[PDB]
Amino acid sequence: PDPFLIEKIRENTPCMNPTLANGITVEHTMTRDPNTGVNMTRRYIDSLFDISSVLFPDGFKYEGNRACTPLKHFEEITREYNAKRIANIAPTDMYMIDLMFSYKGEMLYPRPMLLPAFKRGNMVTINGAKYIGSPVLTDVGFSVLNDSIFIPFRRTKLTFKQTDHHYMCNGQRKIMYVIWSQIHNEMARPHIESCLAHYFFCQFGVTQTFKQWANVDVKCNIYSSATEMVLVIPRHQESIFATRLIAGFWYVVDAFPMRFTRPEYVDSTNLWRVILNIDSHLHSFCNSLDEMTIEELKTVGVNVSTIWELLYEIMTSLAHHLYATDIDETSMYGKRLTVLHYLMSEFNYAVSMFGYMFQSRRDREWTVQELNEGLKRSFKLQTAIKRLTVDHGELDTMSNPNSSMLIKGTSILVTQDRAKTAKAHNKSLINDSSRIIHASIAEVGQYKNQPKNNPDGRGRLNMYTKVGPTGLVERREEVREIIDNAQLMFRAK
Amino acid sequence: LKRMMPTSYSTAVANAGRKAFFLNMYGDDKIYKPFPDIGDVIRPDGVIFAIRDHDDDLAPAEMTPRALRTLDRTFDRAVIGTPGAKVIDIDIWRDERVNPSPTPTGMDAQLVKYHTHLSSYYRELLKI
Amino acid sequence: VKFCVEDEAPTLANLYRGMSSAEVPDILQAKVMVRRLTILPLNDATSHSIVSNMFRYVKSNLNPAERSTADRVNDKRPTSFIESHKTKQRVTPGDIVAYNLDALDVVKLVHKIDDTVPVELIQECLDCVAVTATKDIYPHQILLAQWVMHKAFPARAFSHINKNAVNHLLAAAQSLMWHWGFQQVAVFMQVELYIQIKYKDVMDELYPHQRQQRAINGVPVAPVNIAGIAVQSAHASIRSSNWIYHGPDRLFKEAEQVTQNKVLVVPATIKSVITELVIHLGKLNQ
Amino acid sequence: LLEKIGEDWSAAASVKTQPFGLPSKLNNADRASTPGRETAIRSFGESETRSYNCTVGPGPTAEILDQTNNPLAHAAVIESWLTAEKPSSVPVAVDREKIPFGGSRPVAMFDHLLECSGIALEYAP
Amino acid sequence: MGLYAKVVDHNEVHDQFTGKRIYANDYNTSNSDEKEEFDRHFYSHFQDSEAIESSVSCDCRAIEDAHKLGVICDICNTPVVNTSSRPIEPSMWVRTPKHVRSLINPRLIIMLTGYLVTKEFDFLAYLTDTSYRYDVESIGSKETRRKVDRLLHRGFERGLNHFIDNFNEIFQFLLDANIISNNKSEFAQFVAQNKDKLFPKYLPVPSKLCFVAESTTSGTYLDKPIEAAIDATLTFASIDASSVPLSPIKAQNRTMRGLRLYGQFYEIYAKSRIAQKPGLARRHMFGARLNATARAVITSISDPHDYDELHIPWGVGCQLLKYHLTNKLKAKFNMTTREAFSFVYENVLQYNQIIADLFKELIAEAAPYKGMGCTFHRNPTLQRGSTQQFFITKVKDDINDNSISMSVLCLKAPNADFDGDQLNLTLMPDVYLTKATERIAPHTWVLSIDEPHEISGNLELQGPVVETIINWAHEKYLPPLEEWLK
DNA sequence: TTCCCAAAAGCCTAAAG
DNA sequence: CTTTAGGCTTTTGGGAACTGTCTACAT
RNA sequence: AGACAG
Ligand SMILES: [Zn+2]
């Protein structure tokens, strides 16, 4: 070929994204700060421990983690363990850190752990097998699905659904949406579902709830059941949130009311808890909000600081997403390209369980022996790796007969349902409003690149995608123009 | 089709300890060679290792120089690759802290050779 | 216681042881018672208571396982259920059928070993097999037949082929021994129940692959030839018990060992004859 | 050029058997030990045995599945191949008088398991 | 005439065994020796994840030779039989304890479990054993509560001996009011016709091959359903492994517990290891893993040929016709069978004139046929043409051709296109099987199965041939008829 | 996972001693 | 009048393509 | 049970 021709072809060609071509997992896992030499995984571990540090008994400080010497790495991998110094001969690309805690200024036994040590091109070698580490396209703060607001926490994976209900106002029948959410996992007379207003009435008094979350008063315009009790509200101080509370109240009361004899007991709390008495579950739900969720909700445009504020926002501001949603599940803009949160799901779960089962024992003095036993039983060597090859669907087996990492290696995205992969499910992908055509594919993902994994364009990643810091999918302006028009046609009626 | 010849890289793994010993497939009566050297060519019948189970009572039957060269398709364990395929390299792992060496004397020449080279390489890495 | 146881559951483990448851418761218761118661214381317171313680114781025881690893019970989750366990057999059955049909002939295999063998010896050995097939086959016979016939018949097949094939191979090996001159060992082939300096040097030259031995009290020891221990095993097997001869009368007369009582007296210088047989096999092979 | 270039052909006159007599899959060490794969292909599935039972009488199909399932029948087939002046065009592979039907391992297992429950499938009289 | 199920009298099977009868009652367990003997009789063990070498062996792994066939092993008092052809017989037996009248047939237990056993109450358990705890006020149903009340008011004794001895009256009461409520006529007739076979004295514990334990690094892999069976047997062991002899009521309770464990085991095993998509009936009883079978990419011959003509390649021909080549080598050349296998395997990846001549002579000696008869399968098997007979005619001399020259005409009968699809090939080992397969030969799908007098569309010529015929016939190489005449 | 479809549970209503 | 039969509505559970290759698996 | 081939 003419060298000048190749030069002009290069000049008249847009370059790809070095962030995405060289491996986005590489950047989000194995990138060192210049001020201090610390990987992204190490910083993520420090962030998780700093978040969980609120649950320490005043002196169990988490000092940090260090990088283990390969001398110590080999000594710790190959332990005695009943007179058999067992070693696994395999490439097994890994690196060891040690988490160090402090108690009143004195060191404990450091807990060593192993970490994947991704290579360029999203490549790892685990137990002698070459795996490809793909990012997971996640929703930033919460997802809107067919009829649901799906919000994940560190522990729970909650879903906010809604139904319709009837109530009489001024003698005329009216219909309002009641928003519910099953939270007691063991849960799975008309059968009803746990309304959010039911949780409000279970925690606070009914009059207390109305006064605290609205400028509305309650007696015992007029609101009454359909098919006794009477709730009277000032003629001018009305709101949609108060009406939703009334609808949820009647939804929880109309089917049950064999336990309602004196209406004044409705202002109490034990009666509502009986109607729903797992006070441990109630307290976990109350203190079931963490820093990462709050930060993500702030990023999206919500101002949650307490879970009750979250319930108020969902009941008043985010309920718009339940019946007529401005955003759509079909698109892929405004989404994160998360890697660590899914790779370290095992480690995140281990840290959470350690914290909870450590706070739940006692609030008394802690001995060094008991702390060491807890750390030994919590932070093992392969805590974050035992389930990498079986429980994580973002790590696939590499079978690329090419020298190019773009075509199959570095351009794979995995949906959350396909990311877990522990379900072993098949949604049939046809009767799904999620997998509809959207112009977002053309900018995020590759249409006409249709593997049997995801036959639509969401399976792979568009290599020119503009992705900013912290793995947020940004929108390139220019093509956006054309893209906008296409979207309208996709919804032509 | 000559212009389109894919290149295929393959790895053959064989374990020989107290269970079995390598046969002689790339050496004459004088020189014992279990597997091809680096840069060597596999036999016209692609066969490597061909390890035979170790039995003392069958010594004058399956340990004579003719029996070592001869391969019985049944009762022996060979790894069969593409014939004429040039050998890229060999990786040798040895457990050197067994007082009775399971491999009888004579059939550990190339093994010790490559293991010594690899040991020097890793020792130099460790020294660095 | 128862219751416681128842509650627781148881586981398985327881168963383981065985036882038843128832027873346881018772035882436781016883234881417681024883233881416681016783122781315681018562018173115281512280312590514791017683118751517581117782318761625781128862638871523780128851558871144980826791404490222481091993010796624990795990319920595997099983592309079907019968073939869910990875435990195969080392040998294809068709190879065994072929080796049976092969060993059913003796003249071809004998001429494969040595072309210069009279057929009258083969006929006498087959006539003796026609009577000897009722009784049992003993390990020394199989070992000698494996040693003598490996240039035409694999040794390990002797552990898979049927009894009639083993009897025919014993007849062929006895004929080969009788022709070679090792009549004493040939006598010990179709039977019913009822190393010197020059040899060492020659066998070491013929069998350069020798078993390594443990260093005694720190000082390393010289290796021991595997053919030597095989010869010792055959010698011990032959001297294990007394025997009744069921074979050709001509070979029995040539053996220079005749006893009025219906017992096959083992010659004092039998290990030397076995060593000579092994030396002849080694010379023939290499 | 693409992958799936071939070289995965699996021709097997006779396949090594499990202790419970039935052909099995090939483990890595035992699959990399033969020139070309030596797998026992499941060319008689439910659909294939349906087509055979319908197009041909169930007799020959049961005979094929008995030769495959019963190790003695397969040994007889190989013996017939080896002990014939013409290995091709063998008059009868398995002499059913010497080897009667009903010796197939899966069917014997099924019948024994039912008999341990107190039942047995038998033809109507 | 059909195929129905028949109840088997376990007493007849026990009497017809006439061999080494060892009972599971006499395993006191709780010690190394008896536990090891029980593990030898039960628990077919695979010590390591490695291929075994004992083609023929006894119950113990001590007689590794195969010529000792039918020799009773002194250690086990069991004859030596082929491992693959080992007879499938009940491993153990269970007899009635010293204070139990008889044993209930497991089929009867499973049949009664469908109706008597209920979530809110276990009628069979209440009727049979005494150590059953229940609360009447805890019954959250109404029909079940009424059934329980009626049963309580009737007032039967809760002993196993009473249940067995007075089974007629108890069963009639179960029929009468509401207890089964369906299939009354069939079940009553079944009980009336096979009453004697429902209470056998002896009960067989299934074969050693039924229960598999595979020991390996990280423990000993077992199955789930086996567990139930184990418990049942262990229960009967605990009947006799008691320091203090059990009272007759306790013996009846333990016997009923063991019988219920057997019933649960058989139900679960029939639901899981047979009924499921992978299993015994739907995986092995109707075809699995043929021998003398090959599978290869279909590349064909675009040459003047026959439709019943197939070309198996060098490697497939050598491995598939392994014993045919061995027979030819032994018959012609003074070669031992070991040398024959060595030659054949050595010359699979390499070409020679001798083996090619042997293939040609085999195909020629297949006299009243084009070659060696065989069946050819395309998956999924939808139509008659998915499976079709062909005749092998020539192994290809090119070692690089791992291809299978099926005829062009027979392509449309399956959905076979040369886009990189592997098809299956089964070698017919008999002339009788070839004659039987002649009904699956391609000439059977010529006539359309959906049109009265029409040849099926599967016989239509392929694309290139049709286009060639078009470009030849439909050409203006002559003037029109009027101009041709004028 | 979600849709198919049969079988057992459960419920109101009705007929005979 | 009391005590069960009968048929309709709920709830639950087994089941959901064929062949072949490869991949995963102790603490 | 995930991918791939048809
Ligand atoms: Zn035995």
Between the alpha carbon of residue A202 and those of residues A207, E53, E73, the distances in Å are 12, 70, 75
Asked whether the CA dihedral E51, E57, E58, E63 is positive or negative, the reply is negative
End-to-end CA distance of chain C: 74
Distance from residue A318 (CA) to nucleotide H2 (C1'), in Å? 37
Is D15 in Cβ contact with C92 (below 8 Å)?
A: yes
Distance between Cα E224 and ligand 1 center (Å): 29
* E193, E198, E199, E204 alpha-carbon torsion, rounded to 10°: 140
SS3 A362: coil
Strand segments (E) across E156-210:
203-205
Rounded Cα gap, residues C176 and C92, in angstroms: 29
Place of tokens 């191949």: D81
In angstroms, what is the resolution?
3.3
Token pair, residue E114, equals 């469908």
Rounded Cα gap, residues A27 and A22, in angstroms: 9
SS3 E59: coil
Is E336 in Cβ contact with C109 (below 8 Å)?
A: yes
Write the residue in D20, D75, D106 that is nearest to C93 by C-beta. Answer: D75
What is the pairing mode between strands D119-123 and E212-216? Answer: unpaired
Distance from residue A423 (CA) to nucleotide G16 (C1'), in Å? 17
CB-strand contact A397/H, under 7 Å: yes
Region of E374 please: left (phi>0), alpha (psi -120 to 50) or beta: beta
Rounded Cα gap, residues E293 and E291, in angstroms: 5
Length of chain C: 286
| Nearest-neighbour CA in chain E from C87: distance (Å) | 5
Disruptive mutation site among B57, B58, B68 for chain C (greatest number of C CBs within 10 Å): B57
Length of chain B: 128
Between the alpha carbon of residue C176 and those of residues A254, C188, C274, the distances in Å are 103, 13, 14
Asked whether C160 and E56 are in contact (CB, 8 A), the reply is yes
Asked whether E376 and E407 are in contact (CB, 8 A), the reply is no
Where is E5: in which H helix or E strand?
A: strand E3-7
Rounded Cα gap, residues E245 and E240, in angstroms: 8
E58 assigned binding-site residue: yes
Interface contact C239, partner B, CB < 8 A: no
What one-letter code names the amino acid at E52?
A: I
Contacts of D1 in chain E (CB under 8 A): none
Rounded Cα gap, residues A356 and A288, in angstroms: 11
Asked whether C141 and C158 are in contact (CB, 8 A), the reply is no
Closest residue in chain B to residue D2, using alpha carbons only: B6
Give chain G positions with protein CB within 7 A: 4-5, 11, 14-27
Between the alpha carbon of residue B78 and those of residues A255, B28, B48, D32, the distances in Å are 75, 18, 6, 8
CB-strand contact E143/F, under 7 Å: yes
Rounded Cα gap, residues A223 and A229, in angstroms: 9
Rounded Cα gap, residues A126 and C115, in angstroms: 59
Rounded Cα gap, residues A195 and E297, in angstroms: 61
Asked whether B70 and C285 are in contact (CB, 8 A), the reply is no
Rounded Cα gap, residues D103 and D67, in angstroms: 10
Method: cryo-EM
Distance between Cα B55 and ligand 1 center (Å): 23
Give the CA angle between residues B80, B85, B90 to the nearest 5°: 80
| Nearest-neighbour CA in chain D from C81: distance (Å) | 11
Where is A25: in which H helix or E strand?
A: helix A24-29
Distance from residue A276 (CA) to nucleotide F13 (C1'), in Å? 36
Asked whether D52 and D44 are in contact (CB, 8 A), the reply is yes
Write the residue in C70, C78, C160 that is nearest to E66 by C-beta. Answer: C160
Rounded Cα gap, residues E15 and E9, in angstroms: 10
For residue C266, how many other CB atoms are within 10 A of its CB? 17
Distance between Cα E22 and ligand 1 center (Å): 14
Distance between Cα E57 and ligand 1 center (Å): 8
Q: What is the DSSP string of C150-201?
A: -SSS-SGGGGTS-HHHHHHHHHHHHHHHHHHT-HHHHHTSSEEE---HHHHH
Is B73 in Cβ contact with E342 (below 8 Å)?
A: yes
Distance from residue C9 (CA) to nucleotide G13 (C1'), in Å? 22
Disruptive mutation site among E198, E267, E291 for chain D (greatest number of D CBs within 10 Å): E291
Rounded Cα gap, residues B111 and B90, in angstroms: 10
Surface of B (40-79) touching E: CB under 8 A: 44-47, 70-74
A237, exposed or middle or buried, with CB in 10 Å at 0-12, 13-18, 19+?
A: exposed
Q: Which nucleotide is nearest to D44 (CA to C1')?
A: G19
Asked whether A89 and A71 are in contact (CB, 8 A), the reply is no
SS3 E150: helix
Rounded Cα gap, residues C100 and C92, in angstroms: 13
Write the residue in C70, C89, C160 that is nearest to E217 by C-beta. Answer: C70
Contacts of D26 in chain E (CB under 8 A): none
For the CA atoms of chain A, what is the radius of gyration?
27
Is D40 in Cβ contact with E289 (below 8 Å)?
A: yes
Strand segments (E) across A358-469:
395-397
